[PDB]
Design a protein around this ligand. Structure first.
Ligand SMILES: Nc1ncnc2c1ncn2[C@@H]1O[C@H](CSCC[C@H](N)C(=O)O)[C@@H](O)[C@H]1O
Length: 203
C-alpha cells in the first residue's frame, strides 16, 4: 500500500490544530497522536498555563502537537524528536503556527544530542515519552540539562507499569527533582507530572 496520511482535528484554547499523522512511511510510534498528548493539551487549556514569552522545549514530540499548542499560546518553542519525525513535525508547524508564532524544529536524541542545546529553558515538555526503560537515564540527564534552575518540566504519561512508568516517576525522577502529580485523569489513566530541580532545604 502507498504511504498515506490521516489528519486529526483539534481546537485547543480556541485555536485550530490540524495534525497530520504520516502512516506507512516507517515513523512507527512517532506517527500517532497518543493519549497523554491530548491530556496535556487539555490541561494547558483548563489551567491556562502561561507560555507567553517563555523559552520552551518539547522532547519526543512525534507529530508536534503539544509544542504547537505551546507556540500558539505565545511560547518561544523548540520542538524536538529523532531525525525520523522532523519532517512530520515541520509540516504540522507550517500548517498551524502563524507568522508571529515561534516554533523551531530540531533533532534531539536523548542523552546524545543534549549538549548542542542550551541549559536555559523555562519549560521542558514531554507527552508519552516514558516507555523505553533502557532510555531512562538518557532522558533523565536530558531533562536535567535543559531545565534552567528555576524552570519547570511537564511530563504526561499513560500509566503502564510494564513499560517502567512507575519506576521512572516513583524512583528515578524524584531523586533530583521535586515532583508534583499535577493532575490525574482517571478515565484516560494519564498522569501529568510537574517537576522542578530539587532544592536543598534550609532547615
Ligand atoms: N532516544 C530518543 N530521543 C528522542 N526522541 C525519542 C527517543 N526515543 C523515542 N523518542 C520519541 O518519543 C516519541 C514517543 S511517541 C509520543 C509522541 C507525542 N509526544 C505524543 O505524545 O503523541 C516518538 O516520536 C519517538 O521518536
Amino acid at each position: 500500500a502507498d504511504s498515506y496520511s490521516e489528519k486529526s482535528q483539534f481546537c485547543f484554547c480556541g485555536h485550530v490544530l490540524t495534525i497530520t499523522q504520516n502512516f506507512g512511511s516507517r515513523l512507527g510510534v512517532a506517527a500517532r497522536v497518543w493519549d497523554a498528548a491530548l491530556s496535556l493539551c487539555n490541561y494547558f487549556e483548563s489551567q491556562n498555563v502561561d507560555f507567553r514569552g517563555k523559552k520552551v522545549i518539547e522532547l519526543g514530540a512525534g507529530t508536534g502537537i503539544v509544542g504547537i499548542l505551546a507556540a500558539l499560546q505565545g511560547g518561544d518553542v523548540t520542538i524536538t524528536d529523532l531525525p525520523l519525525a522532523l519532517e512530520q513535525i515541520q509540516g504540522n508547524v507550517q500548517a498551524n503556527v502563524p507568522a508571529g508564532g515561534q516554533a523551531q524544529v530540531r533533532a534531539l536524541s536523548w542523552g546524545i544530542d543534549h549538549h548542542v542545546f542550551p541549559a536555559n529553558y523555562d519549560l521542558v515538555l514531554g507527552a508519552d515519552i516514558v516507555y523505553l526503560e533502557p532510555t531512562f537515564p538518557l532522558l533523565l540527564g536530558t531533562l536535567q540539562h535543559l531545565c534552567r534552575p528555576h524552570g519547570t518540566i511537564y511530563l504526561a504519561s499513560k500509566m503502564r507499569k510494564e513499560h517502567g512508568t512507575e519506576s521512572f516517576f516513583q524512583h528515578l525522577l524524584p531523586q533530583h527533582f521535586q515532583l508534583e502529580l499535577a493532575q490525574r485523569d482517571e478515565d484516560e489513566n494519564v498522569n501529568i507530572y510537574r517537576a522542578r530541580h530539587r532544592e536543598p532545604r534550609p532547615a
